[PDB]
Amino acid sequence: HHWGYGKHNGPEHWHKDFPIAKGERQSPVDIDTHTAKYDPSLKPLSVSYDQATSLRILNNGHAFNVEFDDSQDKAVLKGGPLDGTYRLIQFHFHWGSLDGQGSEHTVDKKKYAAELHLVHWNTKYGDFGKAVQQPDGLAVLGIFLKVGSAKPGLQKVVDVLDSIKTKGKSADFTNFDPRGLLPESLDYWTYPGSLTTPPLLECVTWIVLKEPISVSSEQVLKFRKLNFNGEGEPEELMVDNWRPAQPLKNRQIKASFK
Ligand SMILES: NS(=O)(=O)N1CCc2ccccc21
Ligand SMILES: [Zn+2]
């Protein structure tokens, strides 16, 4: 009886196995745009993905992960609120059954159709497993998706999903350039938070971009054909794999922009 996104094992249940679910820096949160304060001190954000090496795409039963070679400083995130260098390890998405839900963060209580998470780990801790035990171990770049025009840089991801329909399936996924998933502006909000799935560790500096990317209805419909289940099991469509907003508690959300 594992965690998931159903009535019986969904976010309102996670606290029983993972009591930090009710902790002091849980994610996601609602971003109240009128309460977020411009922080003139935030350093410029640096997204350096030119040398990124994608390797594989995996359906893990909760989402699909595009995995990178993180055995050297190829693809790194620096600057903004960050001290030091954070190495890209994977990206994934969270999405809805309908276009009116799917994001984990909200903006003035608005839900987007989906949310992209680019996961990076602080290289001063040596490996990802050590980094997640630290309060500044990870930096997650979050990007909202709205439905409208296609995102050409997403289509290579969309077209492989048929080959990883069910939990535990993977496929080779080399030479994918995650720069094609970014919006034009790097204006962001930032706050200290957590993983949004078990084990809900409080190790993340969240960096959520203000500008959403546009994807087509056909692109997101292909995300919604994935399965939570394993091969041969009763089909359970992989939809609504998002955690709702958590209490902000004793935190301030900072804006990079006026
Ligand atoms: N949104 S999420 O919590 O699933 N996420 C962000 C940080 C991280 C680390 C390892 C695996 C996944 C992720
Ligand atoms: Zn995520």
Residue 34: CB atoms within 10 Å: 5
Q: Say what the resolution is, in angstroms.
A: 1.3
Strand partners, 189: 208, 255
5: which DSSP letter?
Answer: S
Q: How far is CA 184 from CA 25, 33, 47, 123, in A?
A: 29, 20, 12, 27
Expt. technique = X-ray
The domain ranges of the chain are: 2-258
Nearest CA to ligand 1 atom 7: 195
Q: Give the burial class of 40: count Cβ atoms within 10 A of its Cβ; 0-12 exposed, 13-18 middle, 19 or more buried.
A: exposed
Nearest CA to ligand 1 atom 3: 195
Rounded distance, CA 235 to CA 214, Å?
29
Indicate the CATH number for domain 2-258. 3.10.200.10
Strand partners, 227: 237
* Residue 105 annotated in active site: no
Angle subtended at Cα 43 by Cα 39 and Cα 47, rounded to the nearest 5 degrees: 120
Q: Which helix (H) or strand (E) holds 223?
A: helix 217-223
